[PDB]
Symmetry: C2
Subunit: 153 residues, 2 copies
């Protein structure tokens, strides 16, 4: 019955709080929060490898992928453990997040504690942008805000 | 051969970067970094329970103590897993940290990843302070800066 949390922060107006809960071992992780300061639309929403924030979101590393799969979307079999796809900002720059992934984990093989959550500038083509990059980051662009995923009460 | 890192930040001028390395499982954790913005002198230096930073350093919780023991110094048998004692700011407000604890861990029973590192306003009486509070928090005072301990490369 583990829970985690993450405070997203960046140079920009982008900022938010995201919550993680995984009622059962191995079970799904419910992900929910709110983010403001985003352009209206879709933004790449990924768990990168390191909880390193010494050089800002830059130092977070690549998508978190214990598995050396290519990029992809949440529902894709070939995907990074950390591709949570995209989040949607309404007309008031507010993305209201409610996700439920079964690849990520708050414990065990794909534990994401101590790692960084990043919301990207533009959307994640899920690997359908027709160029090498689309198969790497799904062409997400600059990292607007991040935060180390820490253990909540 | 696991490594971790933490970026300390607070409302004040206090800020810094702290590094964790634990070459062997169960082995000691080498702790080192620099902190600036501190009054010259000694400051309480503790790992608190939660990587929750939603309400700033406030939301970090109590000293991290899986043990349910009494507060104390790093060199005590009776101490919290997270009492790293104190750090020392020179005449230029710079504390240069080099510690080596064997109670904390980057893996296993006393894992501290996903948790918050806090440097306090005043010093940690080490329990030798004369009042119950001394033996709850070594009377450290307001929390000047913190950061969730994340996984480094």
């Amino acid at each position: 019955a583990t829970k985690a949390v993450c405070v997203l922060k960046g140079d920009g107006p982008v900022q938010g709080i995201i919550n993680f809960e995984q009622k059962e071992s191995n079970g799904p992780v419910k992900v929910w929060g709110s983010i403001k300061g985003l352009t209206e639309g879709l933004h790449g929403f990924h768990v990168h490898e390191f909880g390193d924030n010494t050089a800002g979101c830059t130092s977070a590393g690549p998508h978190f992928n214990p598995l050396s799969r290519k990029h992809g979307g949440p529902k894709d079999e070939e995907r990074h453990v950390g591709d949570l796809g995209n989040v949607t900002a309404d007309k008031d720059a507010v993305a209201d997040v409610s996700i439920e992934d079964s690849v990520i984990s708050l414990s065990g093989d794909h534990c994401i504690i101590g790692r960084t959550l990043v919301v990207h500038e533009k959307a994640d083509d899920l690997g359908k942008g027709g160029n090498e990059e689309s198969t790497k980051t799904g062409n997400a662009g600059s990292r607007l805000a991040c935060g180390v995923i820490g253990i909540a009460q």
